[PDB]
Design an enzyme around this catalytic site. Structure first.
Site, short mmCIF file in Angstrom:
data_model
loop_
_atom_site.label_atom_id
_atom_site.label_comp_id
_atom_site.label_asym_id
_atom_site.label_seq_id
_atom_site.Cartn_x
_atom_site.Cartn_y
_atom_site.Cartn_z
N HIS A 14 0.83 -1.19 0.00
CA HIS A 14 0.00 0.00 0.00
C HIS A 14 0.87 1.26 0.00
O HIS A 14 0.47 2.28 -0.55
CB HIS A 14 -1.02 -0.04 1.15
CG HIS A 14 -2.06 -1.10 0.97
ND1 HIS A 14 -3.14 -0.94 0.12
CD2 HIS A 14 -2.16 -2.34 1.49
CE1 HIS A 14 -3.88 -2.04 0.14
NE2 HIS A 14 -3.30 -2.91 0.98
N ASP A 111 -5.74 5.64 0.98
CA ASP A 111 -5.99 4.40 0.20
C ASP A 111 -7.40 3.90 0.52
O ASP A 111 -8.02 4.40 1.48
CB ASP A 111 -4.93 3.34 0.49
CG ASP A 111 -4.82 2.98 1.97
OD1 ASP A 111 -5.87 2.90 2.63
OD2 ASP A 111 -3.68 2.78 2.44
N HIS A 349 -0.29 -11.67 -14.86
CA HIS A 349 -1.43 -11.98 -14.01
C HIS A 349 -2.44 -10.82 -14.01
O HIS A 349 -3.49 -10.94 -13.39
CB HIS A 349 -0.98 -12.36 -12.60
CG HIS A 349 -0.19 -11.29 -11.92
ND1 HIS A 349 0.77 -11.56 -10.97
CD2 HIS A 349 -0.23 -9.94 -12.04
CE1 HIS A 349 1.28 -10.43 -10.53
NE2 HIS A 349 0.69 -9.42 -11.18
#
Length: 454
Positions: A14, A111, A349
């Site tokens: 983060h 965040d 991915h």
């Protein structure tokens, strides 16, 4: 100098994206940034070295530690993160009070898990903002998740029909974000709680651009007036033996194969990938993450020699691919690989950071999603933007070597790969345009920043 306060969720995962945002803010504008870091532990070497590398305009303050003993065991990471924020709330208030003595605090940015701070910020007269680190499509999905939760009774994977968000590709329930994959788990309830507070943000920055997600952004910006202003300000991206190897290869000839730090596959699947890569006949750089030895009862491994990191791969594979392939253990400099002229493809991915790096470099994809919101991103890149190819899985869900070779050839030499490559180069062009001096992304961020300068 007016001060912007940024509160990342705990963990390097983060910290990194918001640190990058901090660097953008101080480099483009006359702002100081103060990082307030809720934590459950002392700084690691890695976090210390990152934070010390930042410019003088960016300061950092680790808040009083939350003792993990006062936190529940056996809960998902999202829960741990959310509780850490909650336990640090007083500390953040006190820090904000202290900072107000040193400078005027013009904005607070957190965040997707820092939403508990938004009311606090409003009360102190500081406009709070969300820096959203996934796609606009992902944000749109989350804004609909409350309504979905109410009107849907089954687990989302059991939904009979895909969900169609306005201006977006259809999205099956099994491809919803990983926190929503188990409605019975605390993580799900935590996501919902935070999502319901997105509306309290003064604005939401998304690391995307208009040409990349015209549909999702349009919906976000005009479907519901309740939703805060949404500001696409991307792409924002960061910025060795394998580079030497790449230097020696022809231009556009190498398939880069890399899952992240958190994605790992089964031995069976890794072996199909190895043989599929081999039989494709194409050149490849493969970042390999060894499967962790699972120690069943009565099994005893050898401490005599170091595990060969490639020991798990099929016999003779390594020797056979010496002419055209390179296997790198655990880590490669991804940005440098993606920007290298020898790289012609990326088996990924579909993590958003990885995707954005690929987009800016015009590298087309083979999508292989694993965790978080990757399956959603894969559907978006493959079906929506057509910049990605996708192998067909078997009934069991294993991708066979013959299928992997087919898709590698399709991307590298096939017409579908040509089509995906041209579309990806188009996006690469747009990406360069929107982040230029007068670009749409640059201008929007600048417009929001200007109100902070009063």
């Amino acid at each position: 100098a007016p001060l912007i306060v940024i509160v990342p969720s705990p963990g390097m995962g983060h910290l990194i994206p918001l640190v990058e945002f901090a660097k953008v803010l101080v480099s483009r504008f006359h702002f100081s940034v103060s990082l307030l870091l809720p934590t459950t532990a002392q700084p690691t070497k890695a976090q210390t070295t990152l934070l010390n590398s930042l410019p003088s305009s960016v300061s950092h303050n680790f808040l009083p530690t939350v003792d993990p003993a006062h936190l529940p065991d056996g809960v998902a990471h999202e829960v741990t993160i959310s509780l850490t924020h909650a336990h640090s709330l007083s500390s953040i208030r006190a820090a904000l009070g202290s900072l107000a003595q040193q400078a005027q605090v013009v904005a607070l940015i957190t965040d997707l898990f820092g939403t508990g701070l938004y009311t606090v910020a409003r009360d102190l007269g500081i406009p709070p903002y969300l820096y959203f680190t996934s796609t606009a499509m992902c944000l749109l999905f989350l804004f609909h998740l409350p309504k979905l939760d109410e009107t849907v009774s089954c687990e989302y994977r059991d939904m009979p029909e895909p969900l169609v968000l306005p201006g977006c590709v259809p999205l099956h329930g099994k491809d919803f974000v990983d926190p929503a994959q188990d409605r019975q788990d605390q993580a799900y309830h935590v996501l919902l709680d935070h999502v319901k507070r997105y509306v309290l943000a003064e604005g939401i920055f998304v690391n995307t651009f208009v040409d990349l997600e015209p549909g999702a952004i349009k919906t976000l910006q005009t479907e519901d007036p309740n939703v805060p202003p949404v500001y696409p300000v991307g792409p924002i991206i960061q910025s060795s033996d394998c580079l030497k190897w790449l230097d020696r290869q022809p231009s556009g000839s190498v398939l880069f194969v890399s899952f992240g730090s958190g994605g790992t596959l089964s031995n069976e699947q890794l072996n199909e990938l190895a043989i599929g890569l081999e039989i494709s006949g194409h050149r490849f750089l493969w970042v390999v993450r060894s499967p962790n030895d699972h120690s069943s009862f009565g099994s005893f491994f050898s401490t005599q020699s170091q595990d060969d990191p490639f020991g798990f791969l099929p016999t003779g594979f390594v020797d056979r691919i010496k002419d055209r392939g390179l296997l790198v253990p655990s880590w490669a400099p991804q940005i440098k690989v993606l920007s290298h002229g020898s790289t012609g493809g990326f088996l990924t991915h579909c993590g958003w950071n990885s995707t954005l790096e690929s987009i800016v470099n015009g590298v087309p994809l083979i999508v292989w999603p694993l965790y978080a919101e990757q399956r959603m991103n894969a559907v978006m890149l493959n079906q929506g933007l057509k910049v990605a190819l996708r192998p067909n899985a078997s009934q069991r869900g294993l991708v066979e070597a013959d299928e992997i070779a087919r898709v590698v050839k399709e991307l590298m030499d096939g017409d579908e790969g040509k089509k995906a490559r041209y579309k990806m180069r188009e996006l690469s062009d747009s990406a360069k345009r929107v982040t230029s001096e007068n670009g749409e992304s640059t201008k929007l961020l600048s417009e929001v920043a200007s109100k902070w300068s009063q």
